[PDB]
Amino acid sequence: DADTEKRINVGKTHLQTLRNLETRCHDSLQALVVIDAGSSSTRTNVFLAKTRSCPNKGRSIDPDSIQLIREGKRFTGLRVVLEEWLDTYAGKDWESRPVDARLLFQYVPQMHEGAKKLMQLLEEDTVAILDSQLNEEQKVQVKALGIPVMLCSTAGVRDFHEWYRDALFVLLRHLINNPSPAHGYKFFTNPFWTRPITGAEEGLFAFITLNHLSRRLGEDPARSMIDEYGVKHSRNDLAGVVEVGGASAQIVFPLQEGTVLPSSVRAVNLQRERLLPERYPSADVVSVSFMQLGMASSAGLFLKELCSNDEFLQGGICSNPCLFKGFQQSCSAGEVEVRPDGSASVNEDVRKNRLKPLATYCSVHNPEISFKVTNEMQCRENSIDPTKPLAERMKIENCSIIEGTGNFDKCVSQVESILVAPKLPLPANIEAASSGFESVDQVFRFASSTAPMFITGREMLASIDTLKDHRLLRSDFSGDVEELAEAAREFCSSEVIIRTDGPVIQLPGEQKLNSLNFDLCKTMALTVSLLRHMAAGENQPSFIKWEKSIAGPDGKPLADLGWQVGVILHHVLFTEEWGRTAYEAGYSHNLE
Amino acid sequence: DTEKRINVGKTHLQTLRNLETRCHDSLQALVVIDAGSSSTRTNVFLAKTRSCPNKGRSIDPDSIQLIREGKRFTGLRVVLEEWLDTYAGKDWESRPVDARLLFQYVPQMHEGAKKLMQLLEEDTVAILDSQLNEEQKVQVKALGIPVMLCSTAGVRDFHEWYRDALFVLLRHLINNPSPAHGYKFFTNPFWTRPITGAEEGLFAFITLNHLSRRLGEDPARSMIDEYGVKHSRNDLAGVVEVGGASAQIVFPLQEGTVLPSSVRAVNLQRERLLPERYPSADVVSVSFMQLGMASSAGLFLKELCSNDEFLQGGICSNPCLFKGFQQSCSAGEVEVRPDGSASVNEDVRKNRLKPLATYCSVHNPEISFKVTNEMQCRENSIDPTKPLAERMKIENCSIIEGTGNFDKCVSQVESILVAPKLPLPANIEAASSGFESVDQVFRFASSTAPMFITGREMLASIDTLKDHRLLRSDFSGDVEELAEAAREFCSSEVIIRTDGPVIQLPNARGEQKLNSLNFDLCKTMALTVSLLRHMAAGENQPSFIKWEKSIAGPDGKPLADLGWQVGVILHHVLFTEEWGRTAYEAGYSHNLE
After folding, report:
1. What is the DSSP string of A471-491?
2. Which H or E run includes A51?
3. Quick check: A367 and B431 CB within 8 A?
4. What is the DSSP letter of A288?
5. Which residues of chain B are within 8 Å of residue A425 when distances are taken between CB atoms?
6. Residue A487 bridge partners (DSSP)
7. Residue A577 C-alpha, separation from nearest chain B C-alpha, in angstroms
8. Residue A380: is it exposed, middle or buried by C-beta count within 10 angstroms (0-12/13-18/19+)?
9. Which residues get glycosylated (chain A)?
10. Considering only CB atoms, which chain A residues are within 8 Å of B98?
């Protein structure tokens, strides 16, 4: 009777609810797009993040909620877009002739059409990921909030000549800012999100990714501590990274205990360089990227420098100590396909030749060689005469066949003189040199850290994994130099036998030979050499780890290692700036 | 008329109400210590600060005025090298030194630095005491005195870690002034630091445009368009600055200048040089080491007198020196004596090749690990494997004789300094921005931007010619007019008169006194011709080429000098909130026990 006063308390509660709802923060799902404009392809990366809008606080992204939903299809790389445009508008073999770059300004719309074909494929792919991975309720939130796009180019067009690349970016941004209105997804960009990223930045962003995913980087009490003097330190040591991609290799490490460096070495403070907001703990990080050290890049330059040395090249046969006994290939830097019959199919197509980028850079018709002897000498010391036409620039002279000798020690010594410690810097490395480091050997010589290191890159990992699979390395392997050189010496001493089931690697113990592993021994020599240079440093890393991925809260990786998560964080963490660019201006800045 | 007496009382209330509502102006002192190649000298400035209720305190940028540039004390290079002489031992330039061992002498480096800082402090205080009245001292003393000690070309190429450890010591000394005087000096790692050659040039570019009223944020100097973009009312001007050890070339790019990927231009706002409320500009800024007055004089004699075309029988034939002029074959400091004779100082520290020969050493990691740098040293006739004494020596040379051949002078300045085969040593900064040399600057980038030429000798070049009427008052930068004039003056004869030595002009054009400052002035006339030719070769031409000793400030007299000093102040003071936090909130009180 007087117990139906619960009705009174129901009405008061309906009011109380309605008021909490109008005073609290509200969470909403946002999609973010990072377009990886790499050396071998242009690829979309679709992320999902949780946003929160608070009364009198605006809207912000929860950094720990960032997750990769899908990395899409491998489309045309930017170098191919640009070189196809030059092929049609400057004429064929523009690589071997002087070109009047001014005259190319009359072909900007034609470049726009070239760029349009690629962007339509990427948008189509991005929208399919978004349509297939999201429910209807999620799509409402993602479609309403707008979709920030971050297209960044790396090593592939980093060394591109003249004004062409920077003009392409202008076209790419206009293309992104005008998506099809049909799908409903509001993609948008600006010159801060869509731009070429320097090697040092590519390196800094992969360092931010690693530390974020591994929970070493944070500003909350769980990941950091404020001392009695108001300085915020991270609870766990920030880890450094070595990433070996398709065309370049990055070496990034934080400097421990506020170390004193030589004046020539340029370290970067995360706060002063506006990489990380002031609320995050401070760090002085060494970040250096080497062109010609990526997987495809180093393979073309290694063959060309090795097979130009009379200790290796004799009577038409180049003896390659980095290749297996029984392995044989055509004397070229062209893409290798290991056929089912055991034979090595060397691709003749100039675009697919691994020396094409270097030979394109190394031309007297490129103002960067034409006006600078230092750059010409760098080319010539890597056996590329810039005066010769493109076809002979990439040709291995007086060489018909390359024969594998499977001698790991000779491979290590060759990787050392050619790639790790060359007499002159490898071509197109002014960024590294300006930082104080001409080569890899100089890195751990001038700067060293006790910071733990993570080695990344497909082939960097396959080097260690293969040796672990054959029980040549312990599963707990932690970077022991002698233990790796002994394992690789054994694996690399293997004979290639051609059987009914194809080419096999025989171990005294067997695995099949293929296009991914035929030259894995070169990467093992690169790892050995790098560990040796790391072990000679004044300060040695606390540990070294090879990780394919980093597990998230649910024992499953939230996102991939690389620069993509880092580039997002570098924008989203600057709360005031992100709110104005992504939400205040937003996609509506494009209403026309 | 009691209605009048009540109005006096209402007036008394209004006056006090106005006072607690209005903004209040107060005087502040700002110190810029120029740690240059030749010396370390103070620069005392005054500015008007203004505090407004609920708005804090700020400096009126236009009120910035130089009171005095102080005495020329020891350069940071000398302090560091003197320290190395004592703790790494004598002749460390010719033997390997373990740099790790030198950390045990860090307190001793603090003592060396303390001697210099105390001389600069006594000079700064004497300058203030002499200019300020008793009311002005009270405001200046209460407010705190920001100090900006910046190092340029002299220690830009200093080896190992030495210079950066020195900076940490320097800031500690500045943050602990003599309490006796009452001037509350203070610094931080943002104000006191080595400045790059690019920063050095950008700061000089800011000073020119600030003082000349070209750079502004208000309606008088700027204009906001229908698309909300703020434009400069007048074209911003570029600067060519020639110092003691380096030379800077700075010019804004006029949209849309075609830039290659290799050429890295600076956006003022994006690069946090100027606040966002200021008009945007994309600026090419490049500095060249060995192009300064002293460093280029040393390098020039080395390369010229190691050339078979000029060196024969122990006589080096110098086309840049006057006919009848003679000196001993060394890059030492020249003193022109009353008896016509030239006295060359043989002290190693006074030698103008010392900084280059010190950089160019097989025991310097920048040479021993980098063939690139070793070859730049060798291309300039310096063998880094040799002792310092033979690295500074012009081999098989006793006498340098002047030939007064202007065209031959131009030819050699072009070859050695302007367009050398390899970049001149210690120029990784220039090369990283896309430029190996001065010639490449106007080739890869050029602007229609008006250009101003600055430097002691740069000005004397044009002035000397005008004085003997070989150039017009209206000389606008004509290469052929200048090359004609300089050819006549440079073919002058050295005549010894009762009053002293004289530079006698041909065809009875007159004469002038011969001294230690003008004996090699033709080298700079040749450098000017060379620079104007490269500038004229550009796709875009500077609207005008001007030479200025100083910029006339409001009320006739100049408010400050040309150089990077005003610019570094503005680089800090213009960022309102951040300057308020650093200057006024934390202030000299950050230093309290």
Report:
1. TSS-TT----HHHHHHHHHHH
2. strand A42-54
3. no
4. E
5. 372
6. none
7. 13
8. middle
9. 398
10. none
Query: Pairing mode, if any, of strands B342-344 and B334-336?
Result: antiparallel
> Does A161 sit within 8 Å of B365, measured CB to CB?
no
CA–CA distance, B278 with B276 (Å, rounded to integer): 5
Residues of B in contact with A169 (CB under 8 A): none
Provide the residue ranges of all domains of chain B, joining segments of one domain with +.
Answer: 1-195+562-593, 196-561
Please report the resolution in angstroms: 2.5
Query: Is there a contact between A255 and A449 (Cβ–Cβ < 8 Å)?
Result: yes
> Which residues of A are part of the catalytic machinery?
202
Which of these, B175, B45, B170, lies nearest to B116 by C-alpha position?
A: B170
Residues of chain A that touch chain B, judged by Cβ-Cβ distance less than 8 Å: 102, 160-163, 165-166, 260-264, 367-368, 371-374, 423-425, 430-431, 433-434, 438, 442, 445-446
Q: Solved how?
A: X-ray
Dihedral angle sign, alpha carbons of residues B549, B552, B553, B555: positive
Residue type, B373: N
Architecture (CATH level 2) of domain A1-197+561-592: 2-Layer Sandwich (3.30)
- The arrangement of secondary structure in B196-561, i.e. its CATH architecture, is 2-Layer Sandwich (3.30)
Q: How far apart are CA B160 and CA B175, in angstroms?
A: 26
Nearest CB to A262: which of B365, B421, B422? B365
Mutate to test the interface with A, among B259, B367, B370 (most CBs of A within 10 A): B370
Query: In the structure encoding, which two tokens stand for residue A348, read together?
Result: 């003749």
H helix or E strand, kind and range, residue A138: helix A136-145
Structure tokens at A301: 């330059």
Written as six digits, the tokens of B532 are: 């104007």
Neighbours of A57 (CB within 10 A): 11
CATH of A198-560, one of 3.30.420.540, 3.40.50.970, 3.30.70.260, 1.10.10.10: 3.30.420.540
* Residue of A102, A260, A442 lying closest to B369 (CB–CB): A442
| B162: chain A residues, CB-CB within 8 Å | 263
Same fold, A1-197+561-592 and A198-560: yes
**Gap from A357 CA to chain B (nearest CA, Å):** 16
